[PDB]
Design a protein around this ligand. Sequence first.
Ligand SMILES: [Mg+2]
Ligand SMILES: [Mg+2]
Ligand SMILES: [Mg+2]
Ligand SMILES: [Mg+2]
Ligand SMILES: [Mg+2]
Ligand SMILES: [Mg+2]
Ligand SMILES: [Mg+2]
Ligand SMILES: [Mg+2]
Lengths: 159, 293, 204, 170, 61
Amino acid sequence: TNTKGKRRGTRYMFSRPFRKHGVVPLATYMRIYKKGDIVDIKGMGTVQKGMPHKCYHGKTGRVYNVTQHAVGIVVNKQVKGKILAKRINVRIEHIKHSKSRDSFLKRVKENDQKKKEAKEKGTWVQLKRQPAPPREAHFVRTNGKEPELLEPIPYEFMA
Amino acid sequence: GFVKVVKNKAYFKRYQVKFRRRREGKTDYYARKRLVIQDKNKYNTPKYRMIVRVTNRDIICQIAYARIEGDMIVCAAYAHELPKYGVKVGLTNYAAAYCTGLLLARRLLNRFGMDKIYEGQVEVTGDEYNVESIDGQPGAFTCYLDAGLARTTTGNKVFGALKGAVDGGLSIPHSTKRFPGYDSESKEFNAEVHRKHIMGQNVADYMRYLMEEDEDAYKKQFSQYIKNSVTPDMMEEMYKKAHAAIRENPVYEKKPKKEVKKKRWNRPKMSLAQKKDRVAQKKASFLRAQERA
Amino acid sequence: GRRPARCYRYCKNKPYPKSRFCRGVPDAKIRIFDLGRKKAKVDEFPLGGHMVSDEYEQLSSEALEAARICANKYMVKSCGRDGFHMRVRLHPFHVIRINKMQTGMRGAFGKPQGTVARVHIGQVIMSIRTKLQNEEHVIEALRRAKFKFPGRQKIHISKKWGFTKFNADEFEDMVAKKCLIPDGCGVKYVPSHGPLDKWRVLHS
Amino acid sequence: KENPMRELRIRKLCLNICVGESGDRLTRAAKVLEQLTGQTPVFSKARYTVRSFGIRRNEKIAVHCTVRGAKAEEILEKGLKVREYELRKNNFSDTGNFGFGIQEHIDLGIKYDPSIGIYGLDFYVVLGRPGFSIADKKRRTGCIGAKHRISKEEAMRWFQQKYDGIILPG
Amino acid sequence: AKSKNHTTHNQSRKWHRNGIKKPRSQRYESLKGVDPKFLRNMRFAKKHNKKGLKKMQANNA
RNA sequence: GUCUACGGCCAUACCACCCUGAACGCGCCCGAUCUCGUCUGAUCUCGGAAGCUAAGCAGGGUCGGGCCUGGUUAGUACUUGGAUGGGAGACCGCCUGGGAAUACCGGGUGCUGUAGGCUU
RNA sequence: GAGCAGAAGGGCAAAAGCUCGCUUGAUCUUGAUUUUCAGUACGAAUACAGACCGUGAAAGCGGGGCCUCACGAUCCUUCU
RNA sequence: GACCCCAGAAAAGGUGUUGGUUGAUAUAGACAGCAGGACGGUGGCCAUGGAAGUCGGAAUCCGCUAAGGAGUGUGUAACA
RNA sequence: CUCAACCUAUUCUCAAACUUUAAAUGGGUAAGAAGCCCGGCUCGCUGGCGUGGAGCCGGGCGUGGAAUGCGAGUGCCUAG
RNA sequence: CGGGGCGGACUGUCCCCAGUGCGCCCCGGGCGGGUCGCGCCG
Ligand SMILES: [Mg+2]
Ligand SMILES: [Mg+2]
Ligand SMILES: [Mg+2]
Ligand SMILES: [Mg+2]
Ligand SMILES: [Mg+2]
Ligand SMILES: [Mg+2]
Ligand SMILES: [Mg+2]
Ligand SMILES: [Mg+2]
């Protein structure tokens, strides 16, 4: 029924954003990708070589191999009732560093520094995040101003 | 009107500008991508290039490597600092291009500390020379030429700058096809007329030719050559001494900063209140003139 | 020869416009959408009355034409030939198909039969603008035109001035302040931004 | 008062001779241009096939050459002598450069040759100011700005104030 | 004659009965697919790790 | 306070018209002997330095267009989940959470990296 | 708003289009991978590595066509 | 008439009754009934076989007035 | 003087195979001991460089770095 | 809700006509947050 074409249904997926066509900015070629870092596979359509398949657009993986123009990415793909880790070669135009790993590394560094500093200062500090707790008990001043009475409006036929 | 306005509102609503330096016409991004981008399996290894830019009155030779925040220039040499030694007039020519390329190479090599090793080619001959790395010593500095938007035909001054750099001791891949000595018909490199160009004997030949043909044209052409007392006989020796003096002391001494009053030569932006008041005044003047009738 | 409209009353399919994919569409029955004094200025007809559907349904171009003719006839009878302006504000852009009966439901996709206008709840079908003293005639003309349509419709006297999008109580002093400039049967809104030369053309 | 860099000058002359067909007629026209300018002319091929004109695509149809400098100034003097120093008002374009044509070339200052025909030709004087070449420059190319442009009125003024010509209102 | 053509009905229920398991990750993933030039250099580095052992233990002590 | 060379982001940077530009600089500009290209030294390449900021360029301006960012539109449209809710239906209301886009009205009009100059 | 052989979609401006110059990376090899997928094959494709080359001043780019289609087992035959 | 699916109904109507919205008249006398007047220029002009307020096309005024349309309908060939 | 076309500023109505903008629901990844931080060694890869990268050898860090719940991992044969 | 003294800049009221902004200092008014804060009340 449906064709099996490699770019079927990517009409908007691989298209460029509005007024963002043309020359690829060169910082994307200047990014440094090491083995073990987490990258999101975008898949821009200006460059056709090394393009990922449509099932990897929007997926995140870990770099395991670096070549001259591309990287090898171990990315999970779900095939029916099993998830299996595919290895795909993707040119660096179609990937970027995932910032979730950046934020986590920042938090780890903060935690390590705070633990080392807290042992020296003496007291104990909280390192785990916690879910948003129930709101505390507080007071609400009226400031001598009576709260405004709200009344539902009558119905009127706009147009 | 009778024709559709092409540059209407929708034209600007959909118009996408090019990169700023493409609009300024200063950068070929097609070449820049191929020329500044490092292989990914080389990681943070700097890729060095020798930018050569010829100006109406100057030659700028720089060595830079690309970074995400912007390019980093590690060594720059100018043709306007040539008058410090030897050569005083007739900059932005092929001989000055060689001199500033040699100066850039010597300055960078001195900064890195590789001068006793990689002395380059001191005795200037136009034949091809390529510096090779010495075992047990730090490797030869490798950089690639960046000509920019210059048309790279035989005899372009970017190749004189490159020749100066490679004789200064910088490993820059090149062929002799684009040097002034190359003959396109025979596909042969003379390497002697190229040396003449390096020593500026085409300019000296022009001077002494005008001395035979037209004296007033000679004055009008080389007016500043009569000043500074530069003559076709001493031209080659002037360039040779400039080469030697580049060799001995290539270190750049920045001129000390000056005490300067904070004078603003540019009109600042009008404030929002000023613009609104200007509109109010213009409306009031129009109404008052209408009442005057 | 035409099917009953109950067969195409509801918006069951996705919009099916006449396009390069849908070719050979017969022309809609309604070709005229403005009647009366279309050239009348904005200040002549300040009263506007709308027919508004309460149904999310499809109205055939034939029904739009019939209602247009009926409302026009009543308005001419009551307010004269030049005493009103009517605008039908539904265009039949949806194409309804027919699978005329190889054999059976094999290859059942139909050929273009006709066109309908797809109308939403609260959408205006027809508008009449006229003088203040013809409110009863406008209401009655729209009420008569309601009998040519399948669903339920309401007659609403608009709060706007005529066919504009500005309220009828502020229209006059906006025209006084030159925020509105008449142009034919409508008005042009003049914001307080742009070149001052345009402002100088006004006030002079 | 006026800046010396605003003085009008002749950029190029752009002589053109469009022959109907190829062959010897076009070769003779090329020889006419060679004699007039001392420059090798260049041929122009047909953009499309026109049945009515009997021309085919990529077929040598015209011959032309552009002249700059004192040679262009001299040839313009010759052509304006032929026109007798009067130009029509519509002959000046809105971009500030003008043109005219002649139908006989033997009175331009050339000798008749029986093997050579009687080809007429078109002169199109392109006017400019110092600094117009930034639009043609390779690096940092730009546009000349509004005040520096040449208008039709300034072109006619230059014609009158250089060749004491007459603008016929036709 | 005619019959149903395709459905994924009940397929997700079948998939989740034994769970949809993430691939078993572990230390030391395989070096398959890695750049052969890089790989043969790594093998040379591993081979010559043997030498310089006495300097390592001297520094460690 | 600025510019030049190379840039990063790629209009808050673009476009139209007007005004101002000290000093370096960047240019326009002068020429074709050599190098090198042309129908044309116009472009390109080369050798210059009489003139000029007229142009490019920089800065500023415009109840400027655009662009950027807010308000409004609007808790509207749409929407996750719920009911033995309503209604002949078409559809609609409520509960539980999420939540837009025009028109219209405001504010803004490049930030910045490396190297090197000028500015008493 | 043109063109890029063709259907359509995406992409593209000192491009990927047009005109020139030089060419044969449309070549010789081993593996890995992606797509359909049972994670079988074919086809097509991506990133490499080893040769030998082309072009360019060079950086580089090229092992067919800007990308998405343009195709074929066992047995037998034929050639190298 | 009488309970999800569900096992039968629509447009359109009602001076049946019940709520609601909006407007209007009225102790300067509403509404409804019964009872009086309902004129003059003027049988207004053009249409005509006759069209007089009443088949029609435009006009839609004036005086006396408490008030009256140069006419709401029935009716006449037209009047009445 | 009029009616067209054309242009300009507006105006009504639309799109499964249109789109600047753009949800809700949804898909991927991360939330550490295989980690973090110190020293050192190897390399035929890379190279201005004690460079870069990778590998390896020692050492030190436990507040076990969201919530909630649950014991997991793995192989063979296999019917319908 | 605003006042004093110096550099630019706008207006078709141009006779030291009128109006807007910026940098320094001298004051005046109101609002919010910390303050060994300080007292009083609960
Ligand atoms: Mg390809
Ligand atoms: Mg190039
Ligand atoms: Mg359907
Ligand atoms: Mg069945
Ligand atoms: Mg089946
Ligand atoms: Mg604006
Ligand atoms: Mg809701
Ligand atoms: Mg290879």
